[PDB]
Write an enzyme that holds these catalytic residues in place. Structure first.
Site, PDB file in Angstrom:
ATOM      1  CB  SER A   1      48.823  33.564  38.350  1.00 15.17           C
ATOM      2  OG  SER A   1      47.900  32.493  38.245  1.00 15.17           O
TER       3      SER A   1
ATOM      4  CB  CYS B   1      45.797  32.516  32.722  1.00 14.64           C
ATOM      5  SG  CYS B   1      45.944  33.227  34.403  1.00 14.64           S
TER       6      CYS B   1
ATOM      7  CG  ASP C   1      46.744  29.429  36.482  1.00 17.34           C
ATOM      8  OD1 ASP C   1      46.121  29.060  37.502  1.00 17.34           O
ATOM      9  OD2 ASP C   1      47.757  30.179  36.505  1.00 17.34           O
TER      10      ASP C   1
ATOM     11  CD1 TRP D   1      40.085  34.587  39.457  1.00 14.18           C
ATOM     12  CD2 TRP D   1      42.028  33.695  38.725  1.00 14.18           C
ATOM     13  NE1 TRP D   1      40.787  35.589  38.805  1.00 14.18           N
ATOM     14  CE2 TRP D   1      41.973  35.073  38.354  1.00 14.18           C
ATOM     15  CE3 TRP D   1      43.157  32.935  38.357  1.00 14.18           C
ATOM     16  CZ2 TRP D   1      42.989  35.692  37.652  1.00 14.18           C
ATOM     17  CZ3 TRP D   1      44.166  33.553  37.659  1.00 14.18           C
ATOM     18  CH2 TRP D   1      44.075  34.919  37.305  1.00 14.18           C
TER      19      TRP D   1
HETATM   20  C1  LIG Z   1      44.724  29.029  41.411  1.00  9.56           C
HETATM   21  C2  LIG Z   1      44.301  30.471  41.544  1.00  9.56           C
HETATM   22  C3  LIG Z   1      45.106  31.475  40.994  1.00  9.56           C
HETATM   23  C4  LIG Z   1      44.735  32.811  41.109  1.00  9.56           C
HETATM   24  N1  LIG Z   1      45.495  33.796  40.584  1.00  9.56           N
HETATM   25  C5  LIG Z   1      45.124  35.086  40.698  1.00  9.56           C
HETATM   26  C6  LIG Z   1      45.915  36.202  40.148  1.00  9.56           C
HETATM   27  O1  LIG Z   1      47.000  35.969  39.553  1.00  9.56           O
HETATM   28  N2  LIG Z   1      45.418  37.462  40.331  1.00  9.56           N
HETATM   29  C7  LIG Z   1      44.248  37.749  40.990  1.00  9.56           C
HETATM   30  O2  LIG Z   1      43.785  38.917  41.163  1.00  9.56           O
HETATM   31  N3  LIG Z   1      43.503  36.763  41.503  1.00  9.56           N
HETATM   32  C8  LIG Z   1      43.880  35.474  41.395  1.00  9.56           C
HETATM   33  N4  LIG Z   1      43.078  34.484  41.950  1.00  9.56           N
HETATM   34  C9  LIG Z   1      41.858  34.844  42.687  1.00  9.56           C
HETATM   35  C10 LIG Z   1      42.307  35.286  44.111  1.00  9.56           C
HETATM   36  O3  LIG Z   1      43.078  34.283  44.824  1.00  9.56           O
HETATM   37  C11 LIG Z   1      41.179  35.849  44.998  1.00  9.56           C
HETATM   38  O4  LIG Z   1      39.882  35.240  44.778  1.00  9.56           O
HETATM   39  C12 LIG Z   1      41.079  37.370  44.826  1.00  9.56           C
HETATM   40  O5  LIG Z   1      42.378  37.958  44.657  1.00  9.56           O
HETATM   41  C13 LIG Z   1      40.339  38.064  45.984  1.00  9.56           C
HETATM   42  O6  LIG Z   1      40.842  37.729  47.274  1.00  9.56           O
HETATM   43  P1  LIG Z   1      40.484  38.647  48.571  1.00  9.56           P
HETATM   44  O7  LIG Z   1      40.746  37.861  49.849  1.00  9.56           O
HETATM   45  O8  LIG Z   1      41.191  39.961  48.382  1.00  9.56           O
HETATM   46  O9  LIG Z   1      38.898  38.988  48.435  1.00  9.56           O
HETATM   47  P2  LIG Z   1      37.808  38.232  49.317  1.00  9.56           P
HETATM   48  O10 LIG Z   1      37.804  38.898  50.658  1.00  9.56           O
HETATM   49  O11 LIG Z   1      38.065  36.771  49.250  1.00  9.56           O
HETATM   50  O12 LIG Z   1      36.397  38.526  48.651  1.00  9.56           O
HETATM   51  C14 LIG Z   1      36.271  38.371  47.245  1.00  9.56           C
HETATM   52  C15 LIG Z   1      35.052  37.532  46.985  1.00  9.56           C
HETATM   53  O13 LIG Z   1      33.884  38.313  47.262  1.00  9.56           O
HETATM   54  C16 LIG Z   1      32.947  38.199  46.160  1.00  9.56           C
HETATM   55  N5  LIG Z   1      32.728  39.469  45.355  1.00  9.56           N
HETATM   56  C17 LIG Z   1      33.619  40.326  44.793  1.00  9.56           C
HETATM   57  N6  LIG Z   1      33.018  41.368  44.158  1.00  9.56           N
HETATM   58  C18 LIG Z   1      31.682  41.189  44.310  1.00  9.56           C
HETATM   59  C19 LIG Z   1      30.411  41.895  43.916  1.00  9.56           C
HETATM   60  N7  LIG Z   1      30.443  43.044  43.194  1.00  9.56           N
HETATM   61  N8  LIG Z   1      29.205  41.370  44.283  1.00  9.56           N
HETATM   62  C20 LIG Z   1      29.142  40.221  45.005  1.00  9.56           C
HETATM   63  N9  LIG Z   1      30.240  39.521  45.398  1.00  9.56           N
HETATM   64  C21 LIG Z   1      31.508  39.945  45.094  1.00  9.56           C
HETATM   65  C22 LIG Z   1      33.453  37.019  45.352  1.00  9.56           C
HETATM   66  O14 LIG Z   1      33.017  35.850  46.063  1.00  9.56           O
HETATM   67  C23 LIG Z   1      34.958  37.147  45.501  1.00  9.56           C
HETATM   68  O15 LIG Z   1      35.702  35.980  45.060  1.00  9.56           O
HETATM   69  C24 LIG Z   1      43.476  33.150  41.821  1.00  9.56           C
HETATM   70  C25 LIG Z   1      42.676  32.161  42.368  1.00  9.56           C
HETATM   71  C26 LIG Z   1      43.032  30.831  42.256  1.00  9.56           C
HETATM   72  C27 LIG Z   1      42.121  29.801  42.877  1.00  9.56           C
END
Ligand SMILES: Cc1cc2nc3c(=O)[nH]c(=O)nc-3n(C[C@H](O)[C@H](O)[C@H](O)COP(=O)(O)OP(=O)(O)OC[C@H]3O[C@@H](n4cnc5c(N)ncnc54)[C@H](O)[C@@H]3O)c2cc1C
Ligand SMILES: NC(=O)c1ccc[n+]([C@@H]2O[C@H](COP(=O)([O-])OP(=O)(O)OC[C@H]3O[C@@H](n4cnc5c(N)ncnc54)[C@H](OP(=O)(O)O)[C@@H]3O)[C@@H](O)[C@H]2O)c1
Ligand code: HEM
Ligand SMILES: Cc1cc2nc3c(=O)[nH]c(=O)nc-3n(C[C@H](O)[C@H](O)[C@H](O)COP(=O)(O)O)c2cc1C
Lengths: 214, 602
Positions: free
Chosen positions: B388, B554, B599, B601
């Site tokens: 976001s 959000c 908004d 996630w």
């Molecule tokens: C429409 C939308 C808007 C968004 N806006 C934002 C925003 O403004 N800011 C923001 O930070 N994020 C936002 N997100 C979430 C974001 O896109 C990601 O999910 C997040 O930032 C992590 O991405 P990554 O690839 O760094 O981590 P990844 O490599 O994808 O791994 C993270 C995933 O691992 C898992 N995980 C994390 N911690 C643990 C734990 N302790 N134990 C077990 N499993 C765990 C969860 O499945 C997690 O979602 C948004 C998501 C959507 C769908």
């Protein structure tokens, strides 16, 4: 109700049911359109949107409509042009038909944009919102019917580039309408105009049904 | 038609698939599914159910190793389809005994309706009720997200489970062919761009999902004041993209797995990563030619194209079973495809839960010396992550700002894992980032006078920063700004209170009317933004009801968003006094009007 959006649905609830049960629509919903049948309607629609979007362009700054200006997210003219190119070939220009129903609709549009801007929004409500509700299923029936490419050619009018969630967008659109300042006299006028617009669509559907099965 | 039992043994089959289709989507699913059997061990046939005598169902176990499958669409208020009518009403008023019959069901649906896959749910339930036995989970396809995606997921894991219950198992049949281009000119090999070759170098609009812009990181500061997690504010310059955006919008991002992580896989797998190659889709009339931009290296793939982080799907583990020399090792892999029993118990525990990524699996299974090309077939594509946008285009025309938590944690795998985008993002020091801007309908209202409630606990404060900026800007323009409320929350005041100073500045500048802050670990009873809302109720009500205020939630979806919703319900229920249930209706109407927007996630 009080809010424009709420009001309009109630005021056009009746008309919608009749528009959707006209023979053309019902048949379409079971997957029964001919290439010519589809071709006709699209052509008709092109004119409509050209008129509508001309008027919008003219009145994009008048506060009776400015809050409903969505060129990026909605505008259908270029998309329609693409579909005309696909469906009528490089000569689509004056190759596409221009039915009486279409003509009447367009001229009403001209009047509305010409001297009744405050009412544009009724037409817009009828059009764009429809496209984001029934439209998505309709697009997908086309593939079964005409079995077209999932490359998407011919269905530009039904594909929405900028709009990530039609449900979400309807949300916003309704709120936008509420943001227009109008007296409930004017509200009633707008509601009437919605009905008028619905009627205009309905008349088209029945016309073209005659000319297909023919 | 002449009975289906007879016609199966007569046409030489064991598996039968029935489809309840209105617009031919269910049929499409059914046909692809019975055609999977043919090269997956057994042999299936898809049929229109209305033309066969359906009493013959407990007569199926007369075919050896038999299974029956159902593909049905849910229509209206959870009612049946055309060719499905005869069956449905029989089912409703039968209870003759189906003991020994194997079955499975997939539901075709849409979350915006409250009868979500009611058709599918009914059929799945009813068969069990008669004495019959389920083999695989009932699928819940969703047209709100993507029905197709939901289907494909389900299908991906069905077949492997089906195989395991029965035995069968060609358990290996390929979908791509490896073509080494061992001596090949340099600039025709993909380096990790997403669209056309050298798309990342030749940057001209349109910029989107297939031609990302590469924005230059203007800065990165740790907003995190403590040490608990790392929370970061980054500034992405889009100067000459001429990308436009509006506050509350998303910015999507194309990350790269940490190359270090990449390298280990390559090592322990024991090939050269820098091997220039292509995998060609050999099912000739599939115009989906390579699973990812080819020609390119394994280095380039694992870094930019493939998802090496999110654990395996069931199916890939079944696929991989074959590269284990060890019998015991093989067995485990084989088991984790079972859709039930011990097999299902295990997989959820030791894979999904423990968050064992591909690499971890390899590390924990020595026998796994699978071919790199075949692995680069079985891996899911690296999904982009979206954020976001935390800025306003009227104050930052040339800059997209993000707020995010960086991910990092001890799993039950013992392995410390890392977040792809977040860790990747973190390393981008003041180094270009491939991103695009996708529209949301999270927006500020047109009338500057309209009051706004913003609820944003944690990083969820993000897009709301943009909102706040825009409101500030309005006041510079001499426009009438309405009431502006931020209901923010964090753990402790000195730890993770995002944008402390700027928010406070906004407070005293008049731009932010009320800065309400929920400090949740500053006592032994937890303090949440719902609490704050409850405290202010009357003030809120006059805003919503008299002022015509907008509502924005959000952030965390699992719990928070719906707790907030409940609080709003209670506010409505008492203050223009309603039945609880009346209040809910009002709330819902609000959303429709577009006055309550989310908004979220996970
Ligand atoms: C429409 C939308 C808007 C968004 N806006 C934002 C925003 O403004 N800011 C923001 O930070 N994020 C936002 N997100 C979430 C974001 O896109 C990601 O999910 C997040 O930032 C992590 O991405 P990554 O690839 O760094 O981590 P990844 O490599 O994808 O791994 C993270 C995933 O691992 C898992 N995980 C994390 N911690 C643990 C734990 N302790 N134990 C077990 N499993 C765990 C969860 O499945 C997690 O979602 C948004 C998501 C959507 C769908
Ligand atoms: O992840 P992140 O960026 O969102 O930050 P986070 O630190 O996980 O959570 C953000 C804030 O919301 C709180 N929270 C947790 N569950 C909640 C719920 N159901 N309703 C309201 N607030 C809740 C947190 O308190 P706690 O984390 O202390 O519960 C914290 O104050
Ligand atoms: C194919 C048959 C059609 C069906 C089944 C259908 C069904 C619906 C439904 C269920 C909605 C409510 C959307 C929601 O849940 O939010 C809706 C909205 C709408 N439809 Fe249709 N529709 C059809 C055709 C049409 C036609 C022909 C028009 C006029 C050209 C039209 C115009 C609209 C409009 C303007 C709305 C918005 C109403 C609102 O604000 O709630 N539809 N339609
Ligand atoms: C008019 C209509 C009403 C629907 N109602 C629901 C519903 O209440 N619940 C649900 O989960 N899905 C519902 N759906 C989703 C459909 O089942 C979905 O569009 C499905 O893909 C259609 O499959 P088919 O093309 O094989 O008929 C509805 C679809 C339509 C067209």
């Amino acid at each position: 109700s009080q809010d424009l959006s709420e009001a309009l649905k109630e005021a056009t609830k009746e008309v919608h049911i009749r528009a959707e049960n006209s023979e053309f629509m019902r048949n379409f919903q079971k997957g029964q359109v001919s290439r010519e049948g589809f071709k006709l309607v699209m052509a008709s629609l092109y004119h409509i949107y050209t008129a509508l979007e001309e008027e919008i362009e003219r009145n994009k700054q008048n506060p009776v409509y400015a809050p409903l200006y969505f060129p990026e997210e909605l505008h259908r003219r270029a998309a329609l042009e693409q579909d005309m190119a696909f469906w009528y070939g490089p000569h689509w220009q004056e190759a596409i038909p221009y039915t009486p129903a279409t003509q009447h609709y367009v001229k009403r549009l001209h009047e509305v944009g010409g001297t009744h801007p405050e009412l544009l929004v009724a037409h817009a409500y009828t059009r764009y919102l429809g496209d984001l509700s029934g439209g998505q299923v309709l697009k997908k029936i086309a593939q079964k019917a005409m079995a077209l490419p999932s490359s998407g050619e011919g269905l530009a009018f039904f594909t929405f580039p900028s709009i990530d969630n039609p449900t979400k967008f309807k949300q916003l659109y309704r709120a936008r309408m509420n943001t227009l300042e109008m007296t409930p006299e004017v509200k009633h006028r707008v509601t009437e105009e919605a009905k008028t617009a619905f009627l205009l669509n309905i008349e088209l559907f029945e016309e073209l049904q005659a000319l297909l099965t023919e | 038609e002449s009975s289906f039992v007879e016609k199966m043994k007569k046409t030489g089959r064991n598996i039968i698939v029935f489809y309840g289709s209105q617009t031919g989507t269910a049929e499409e699913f059914a046909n692809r599914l019975s055609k999977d059997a043919h090269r997956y061990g057994m042999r299936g046939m898809s049929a229109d159910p209305e033309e066969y005598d359906l009493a013959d169902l407990s007569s199926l176990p007369e075919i050896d190793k038999s299974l029956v499958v159902f593909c049905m669409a849910t229509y209206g208020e959870g009612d049946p389809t055309d060719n499905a009518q005869d069956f449905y009403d029989w089912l409703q008023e039968t209870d003759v005994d189906l003991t020994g019959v194997k079955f499975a069901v997939f539901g075709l649906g849409n979350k915006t309706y409250e009868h979500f896959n009611a058709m599918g749910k009914y059929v799945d339930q009813r068969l069990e009720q008669l004495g019959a036995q389920r083999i695989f989970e009932l699928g819940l396809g969703d047209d709100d997200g993507n029905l197709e995606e939901d289907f494909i997921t389900w299908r991906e894991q069905f077949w492997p489970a089906v195989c395991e219950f029965f035995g069968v198992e060609a358990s290996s049949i390929r979908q791509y062919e490896l073509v080494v281009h061992e001596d090949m000119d340099v600039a025709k090999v993909y380096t990790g761009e997403m669209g056309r070759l050298k798309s990342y170098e030749n940057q001209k609009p349109p910029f989107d999902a297939k031609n990302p812009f590469l924005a230059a990181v203007t800065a990165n500061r740790k907003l995190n004041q403590g040490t608990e997690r790392h929370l970061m504010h980054l500034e992405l310059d889009i100067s000459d993209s001429k990308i436009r955006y509006e506050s509350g919008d998303h910015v999507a991002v194309y990350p790269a797995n940490d190359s270090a992580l990449v390298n280990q896989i390559g090592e322990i797998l024991g090939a050269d990563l820098d091997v220039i190659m292509s995998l060609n889709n050999l099912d000739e009339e599939s115009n989906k030619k390579h699973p990812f931009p080819c020609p390119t290296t394994y280095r380039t793939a694992l870094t930019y194209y493939l998802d090496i982080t999110n654990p395996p799907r069931t199916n890939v583990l079944y696929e991989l079973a074959q590269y284990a020399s060890e019998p015991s090792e093989q067995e485990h892999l084989h088991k984790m495809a079972s859709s039930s029993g011990e097999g299902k118990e295990l997989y959820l525990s030791w894979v999904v839960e423990a968050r064992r990524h591909i690499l971890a699996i390899l590390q924990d299974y020595p026998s796994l010396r699978p071919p790199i090309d075949h692995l680069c077939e079985l891996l899911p594509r690296l999904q982009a992550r979206y954020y976001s946008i935390a800025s306003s285009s009227k104050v930052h025309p040339n800059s997209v700002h993000i707020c995010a938590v960086a991910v990092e944690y001890e799993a039950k795998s013992g392995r410390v894992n890392k977040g792809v985008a977040t860790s990747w993002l973190r390393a981008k020091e003041p180094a270009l980032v491939p991103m695009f801007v996708r529209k949301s309908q999270f927006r500020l209202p047109f009338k500057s006078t309209t009051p706004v409630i913003m609820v944003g606990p944690g990083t969820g404060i993000a897009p709301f920063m943009g909102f706040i900026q825009e409101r500030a800007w309005l006041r510079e323009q001499g426009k009438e700004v309405g009431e502006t409320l931020l209901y923010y929350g964090c753990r402790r005041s000195d730890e993770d209170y995002l944008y402390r100073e700027e928010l406070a500045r906004f407070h005293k500048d008049g731009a932010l009317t009320q800065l309400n802050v929920a400090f949740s670990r500053e006592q032994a009873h937890k303090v949440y933004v719902q609490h704050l809302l409850k405290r202010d109720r009357e003030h809120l009500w006059k805003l919503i009801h008299e002022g015509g205020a907008h509502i924005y939630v959000c952030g965390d979806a699992r719990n928070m968003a719906k707790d907030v919703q409940n609080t709003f319900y209670d506010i409505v229920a008492e203050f223009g006094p309603m039945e609880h249930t009346q209040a809910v209706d009002y709330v819902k109407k609000l959303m429709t009007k577009g006055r309550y927007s989310l908004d979220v996630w996970s």
